[PDB]
Amino acid sequence: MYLRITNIVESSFFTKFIIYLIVLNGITMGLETSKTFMQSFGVYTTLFNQIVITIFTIEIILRIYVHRISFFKDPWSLFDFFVVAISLVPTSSGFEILRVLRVLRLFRLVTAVPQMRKIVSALISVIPGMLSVIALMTLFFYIFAIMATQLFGERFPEWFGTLGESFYTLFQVMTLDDWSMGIVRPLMEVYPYAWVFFIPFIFVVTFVMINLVVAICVD
Amino acid sequence: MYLRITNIVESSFFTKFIIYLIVLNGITMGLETSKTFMQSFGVYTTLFNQIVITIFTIEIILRIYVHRISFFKDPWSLFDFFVVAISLVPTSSGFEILRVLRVLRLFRLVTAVPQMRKIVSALISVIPGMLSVIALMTLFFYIFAIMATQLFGERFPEWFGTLGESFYTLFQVMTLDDWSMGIVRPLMEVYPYAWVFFIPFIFVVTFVMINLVVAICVD
Amino acid sequence: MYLRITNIVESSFFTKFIIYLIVLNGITMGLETSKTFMQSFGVYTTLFNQIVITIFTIEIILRIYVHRISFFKDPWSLFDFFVVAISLVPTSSGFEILRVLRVLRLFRLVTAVPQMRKIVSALISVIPGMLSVIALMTLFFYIFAIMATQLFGERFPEWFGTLGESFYTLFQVMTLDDWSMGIVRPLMEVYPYAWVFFIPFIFVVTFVMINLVVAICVD
Amino acid sequence: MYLRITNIVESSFFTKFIIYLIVLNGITMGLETSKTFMQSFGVYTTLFNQIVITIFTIEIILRIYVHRISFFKDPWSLFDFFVVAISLVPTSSGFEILRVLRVLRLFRLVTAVPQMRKIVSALISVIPGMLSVIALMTLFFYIFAIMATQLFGERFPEWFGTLGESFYTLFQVMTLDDWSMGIVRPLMEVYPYAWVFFIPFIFVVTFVMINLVVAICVD
Ligand SMILES: [Ca+2]
Ligand SMILES: [Ca+2]
Ligand SMILES: [Ca+2]
Numbered sequence: 001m002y003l004r005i006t007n008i009v010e011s012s013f014f015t016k017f018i019i020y021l022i023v024l025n026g027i028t029m030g031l032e033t034s035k036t037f038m039q040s041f042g043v044y045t046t047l048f049n050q051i052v053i054t055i056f057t058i059e060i061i062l063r064i065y066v067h068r069i070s071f072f073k074d075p076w077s078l079f080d081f082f083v084v085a086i087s088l089v090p091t092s093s094g095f096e097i098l099r100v101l102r103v104l105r106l107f108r109l110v111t112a113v114p115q116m117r118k119i120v121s122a123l124i125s126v127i128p129g130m131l132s133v134i135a136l137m138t139l140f141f142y143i144f145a146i147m148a149t150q151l152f153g154e155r156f157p158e159w160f161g162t163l164g165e166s167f168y169t170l171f172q173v174m175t176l177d178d179w180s181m182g183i184v185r186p187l188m189e190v191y192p193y194a195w196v197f198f199i200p201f202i203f204v205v206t207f208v209m210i211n212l213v214v215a216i217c218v219d
Numbered sequence: 220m221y222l223r224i225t226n227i228v229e230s231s232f233f234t235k236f237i238i239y240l241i242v243l244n245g246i247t248m249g250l251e252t253s254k255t256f257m258q259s260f261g262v263y264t265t266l267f268n269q270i271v272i273t274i275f276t277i278e279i280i281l282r283i284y285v286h287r288i289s290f291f292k293d294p295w296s297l298f299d300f301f302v303v304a305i306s307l308v309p310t311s312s313g314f315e316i317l318r319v320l321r322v323l324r325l326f327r328l329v330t331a332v333p334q335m336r337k338i339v340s341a342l343i344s345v346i347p348g349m350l351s352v353i354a355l356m357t358l359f360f361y362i363f364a365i366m367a368t369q370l371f372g373e374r375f376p377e378w379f380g381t382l383g384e385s386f387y388t389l390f391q392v393m394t395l396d397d398w399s400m401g402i403v404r405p406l407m408e409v410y411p412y413a414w415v416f417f418i419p420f421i422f423v424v425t426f427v428m429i430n431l432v433v434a435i436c437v438d
Numbered sequence: 439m440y441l442r443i444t445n446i447v448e449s450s451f452f453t454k455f456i457i458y459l460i461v462l463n464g465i466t467m468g469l470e471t472s473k474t475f476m477q478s479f480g481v482y483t484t485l486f487n488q489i490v491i492t493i494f495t496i497e498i499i500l501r502i503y504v505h506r507i508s509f510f511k512d513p514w515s516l517f518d519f520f521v522v523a524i525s526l527v528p529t530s531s532g533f534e535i536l537r538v539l540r541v542l543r544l545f546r547l548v549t550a551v552p553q554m555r556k557i558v559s560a561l562i563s564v565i566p567g568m569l570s571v572i573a574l575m576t577l578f579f580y581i582f583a584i585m586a587t588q589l590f591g592e593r594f595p596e597w598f599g600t601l602g603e604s605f606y607t608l609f610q611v612m613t614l615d616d617w618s619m620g621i622v623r624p625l626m627e628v629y630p631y632a633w634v635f636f637i638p639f640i641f642v643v644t645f646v647m648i649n650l651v652v653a654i655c656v657d
Numbered sequence: 658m659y660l661r662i663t664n665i666v667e668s669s670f671f672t673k674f675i676i677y678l679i680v681l682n683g684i685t686m687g688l689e690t691s692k693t694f695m696q697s698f699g700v701y702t703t704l705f706n707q708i709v710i711t712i713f714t715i716e717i718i719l720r721i722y723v724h725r726i727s728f729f730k731d732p733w734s735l736f737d738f739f740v741v742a743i744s745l746v747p748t749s750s751g752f753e754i755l756r757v758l759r760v761l762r763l764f765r766l767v768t769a770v771p772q773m774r775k776i777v778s779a780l781i782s783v784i785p786g787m788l789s790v791i792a793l794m795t796l797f798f799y800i801f802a803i804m805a806t807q808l809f810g811e812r813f814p815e816w817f818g819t820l821g822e823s824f825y826t827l828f829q830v831m832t833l834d835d836w837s838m839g840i841v842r843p844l845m846e847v848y849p850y851a852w853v854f855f856i857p858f859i860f861v862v863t864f865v866m867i868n869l870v871v872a873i874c875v876d
Contacts, residue, residue: 030361033368033382103365109358119351123430132776139766142683146760149690163690168414172399175421180829181839182400195825202832211780214874217433245580252587252601322584328577338570342649387633391618394640397835401619436652436874468799471806471820541803547796554796557789561868606852610837613859620838655871 002065009059009066018059019112025052026106056084056105076111083108129219133212137205144201145170151197155190159183173198174205221284228278228285237278238331244271245325275303275324295330302327348438352431356424363420364389370416374409378402392417393424440503447497447504456497456550463490464544494522494543514549521546567657571650575643582639583608589635593628597621611636612643659722666716666723675716675769682709683763713741713762733768740765786876790869794862801858802827808854812847816840830855831862 008014028045031037038045060081064071071077083105089098110116145166153160159169173179179198187194227233247264250256257264279300283290290296302324308317329335364385371379378388392398398417406413446452466483469475476483498519502509509515521543527536548554583604590598597607611617617636625632665671685702688694695702717738721728728734744759767773802823810817816826830836836855844851 026361029365030382033365100366100369103362106358106362110355115351116355119355123427126430132772136767136773136776139763142687143760143763146686146690147757151754151757163687168399171418175395175398176832176834177395178397178400178835179832180825181835199828208780210870210873211783213429213433214870216429217436217874248584249580249601252584316589319585319588322581325577325581329574334570335574338574342646345649387618390637394614394617396614397616397619432648432652435648436655464799467803468820471803535808538804538807541800544796544800548793553789554793557793561865564868609856613833613836615833616835616838651867651871654867655874 005062006066009062014059015112019109021052021055022106022109022112025049026109029103029106053084053087057088060084076117080108080111126216126219129215130212133208133215137208140204140208141167141170144197148197152187152191152194156187170201173202176202176206224281225285228281233278234331238328240271240274241325241328241331244268245328247271248322248325272303272306276307279303295336298330299327345435345438348434349431352427352434356427359423359427360386360389363416367416371406371410371413375406389420392421395421395425443500444504447500452497453550457547459490459493460544460547460550463487464547467541467544491522491525494518495526498522514555517549518546564654564657567653568650571646571653575646578642578646579605579608582635586635590625590629590632594625608639611640614640614644662719663723666719671716672769676766678709678712679763679766679769682706683766686760686763710741710744714745717741733774737765737768783873783876786872787869790865790872794865797861797865798824798827801854805854809844809848809851813844827858830859831866833859833863 025048028048031041032045063077063080067074067077072081086098087102087105091099110120145163148160148166148170149163151160153162153166158165160166169183173183179202184194184198187198244267247267250260251264282296282299286293286296291300305317306321306324310318329339364382367379367385367389368382372381372385377384379385388402392402398421403413403417406417463486466486469479470483501515505512505515510519524536525540525543529537548558583601586598586604586608587601591600591604596603598604607621611621617640622632622636625636682705685705688698689702720734720737724731724734729738740762743755744762746755748756767777802820805817805823805827806820808817810819810823815822817823826840830840836859841851841855844855
């Protein structure tokens with residue numbers, strides 16, 4: 001019966017039946033957004049939901065017999081497994097991010113369809129080339145975030161009071177987001193020289209960031 | 220009479236005459252902005268306007284006898300037809316955006332003058348090569364837009380209350396617009412972890428965007 | 439006496455002397471900024487200034503005999519003429535921008551010192567290859583600025599009330615500066631569909647500017 | 658005794674022991690951030706700090722016998738000498754930035770681990786080819802900053818009141834930060850033409866920066 005199912009799983013039909021459900025379950029999840037819609041056809045789509053979820057574990061069980069070890073060394077398969085696994089954790093208990101994390105299954109449209117896989121893969125592949133830089137910056141952020149916490153967090157604890165807060169504010173400054181009118185002019189009414197911290201910070205981070213784009217434009 | 224008019228239409232004088240009317244009517248529309256100018260010479264202008272509109276349909280009628288099907292297979296001609304058609308719906312009735320949409324005829328200056336055509340075409344041609352990425356993005360946006368509506372729409376209905384609002388807000392975050400003081404710091408007064416939703420969102424979206432710029436800086 | 443002065447003007451000493459005055463007059467202009475400095479050495483500097491102004495016209499007078507027509511066809515020289523000219527309009531009558539426009543003479547450091555001429559020229563030379571785009575864009579802005587003045591200027595006259603205002607506001611959206619919370623969300627409290635105007639505007643304007651950067655990174 | 662210590666210093670063990678102290682002290686500094694942690698283990702971590710500070714001077718003393726003059730011509734070594742020296746200045750007297758500047762030693766993780774060294778050097782190397790643009794710009798900034806102080810600093814002293822203030826505000830405009838609703842629209846309530854100063858300023862400054870990115874993507 002093994003080859004019987006290896007023929008079912010690998011069937012163009014099967015993969016297209018899968019892609020058909022993703023597009024349906026996605027259309028259905030956007031409808032679950034409507035407080036109106038749920039009052040009318042809520043029970044329709046709760047069931048439609050549990051239905052698709054079963055079908056998906058059935059596939060994943062089926063997909064594993066056909067592939068075994070090869071399957072748990074496939075990124076896309078591992079993914080598909082974990083994204084359905086999330087979707088199996090009861091509609092209750094623990095955290096309710098798990099209910100919300102269920103919509104991650106629409107990323108299966110990326111998995112199940114090539115060209116997407118190509119594109120995602122194309123993208124992901126650029127990351128290893130960025131890791132020396134990314135490491136550098138994260139060291140850098142860590143260093144300034146400490147500096148900022150101990151220089152400004154007493155008077156400005158919303159923004160710098162804690163190591164994590166400083167990470168966040170520094171991230172915001174880095175996105176050049178509302179940084180002057182929002183953070184540093186305020187800081188300067190108390191610490192006139194705060195500009196000496198944030199201007200060099202900005203330079204380094206924007207400089208570095210430009211290089212990283214130029215590096216991604218030579219690989 | 221066909222070759223008589225094919226010799227009229229294809230004439231340098233004709234095209235240049237058309238280009239003459241565009242720049243005049245365009246000048247004319249900027250004057251139609253002034254509440255002052257309109258009290259003085261408003262009548263002068265609406266008639267010159269209707270005049271121009273006639274002249275333009277005559278041309279397009281003529282242009283078609285001289286090209287027949289070849290015409291409705293020309294992007295630039297199709298454009299011109301559709302823009303004048305917009306300008307044909309009476310100043311009355313339905314939606315009044317139609318009166319406003321008239322000013323789209325000044326895009327005929329792009330259409331009637333080469334080099335522009337060159338540049339537009341040059342630009343537009345880059346688009347097909349982005350569609351794999353644009354699909355990827357739209358899926359991403361759809362998925363996060365759904366999560367956000369269900370994670371934040373109850374306490375923050377202005378920004379996330381509805382799927383469309385979430386799309387808009389997410390777009391705003393993506394343009395890195397006033398995203399921290401404006402949205403996430405608020406969000407966090409209620410949902411301390413909202414940073415776990417928006418920073419990864421910001422990274423992915425900015426990463427994808429960098430790749431897409433480099434993809435262009437190659438093809 | 440021509441060759442006597444053609445030997446004075448073309449001299450290394452002459453040029454390095456000019457450069458020495460520029461850096462000094464520049465230093466002297468940053469000091470004229472301080473109300474403190476001006477209350478104690480204000481006279482020292484106003485005269486130093488009137489001095490340097492003569493020295494510069496003398497040079498330009500000298501420089502002209504030595505080059506004649508060749509001069510009024512050199513970009514860099516023409517510049518220095520007009521810049522010193524600005525500095526000759528008496529400190530009074532007319533407008534006071536002319537007094538402020540005097541500090542433009544510090545651009546002579548670019549004009550009179552090689553390398554800067556190199557870099558400026560390197561930069562400027564890129565401009566011709568952007569002109570098809572710059573035109574394209576201005577048509578676009580002109581068209582949308584007209585649309586916006588008639589779509590939003592009655593309720594929002596600060597921002598869209600006049601053709602030029604729409605130009606300014608549109609510029610701001612294009613720099614993606616404070617565009618959503620500052621302008622479109624407010625606009626949407628009255629015109630729910632305003633998002634239909636500004637999102638496409640943003641896309642086009644952003645797309646085009648990316649291409650333009652890429653164009654420069656080819657030519 | 659030289660070859661004995663030259664064999665201690667040059668050892669894989671020594672270097673990796675150094676790398677071990679950095680990641681330990683760095684971890685320990687993140688803990689010194691917590692007001693909680695300090696109330697429990699502050700003594701522990703103050704002493705651990707002085708320990709590491711000794712060990713680092715010992716090394717720098719050692720590293721110098723083994724290299725002599727070769728050492729004070731090594732950038733990376735020069736760095737470490739200075740960085741430890743900052744950490745030597747008592748935890749009292751002078752300023753308190755000297756206490757804060759101590760966290761700079763964690764940059765030794767860049768200095769004491771290649772690839773980092775590689776990456777930093779890769780970056781720094783890009784600088785010399787920017788200095789022609791960078792010089793140009795600071796002239797540009799200096800010129801406009803002076804203009805702005807005399808055009809806007811009387812009615813608007815917080816933003817343009819002083820040359821230094823104009824530099825800061827001009828920087829903010831350059832990052833295009835909240836430049837319009839924050840600065841130029843206000844300015845225009847008093848000086849309608851202030852847009853004539855800031856729009857060109859914006860163009861020039863962004864153009865130059867676009868060129869500089871393209872330059873770095875050539876060399
Ligand atoms: Ca901003
Ligand atoms: Ca803002
Ligand atoms: Ca505000």
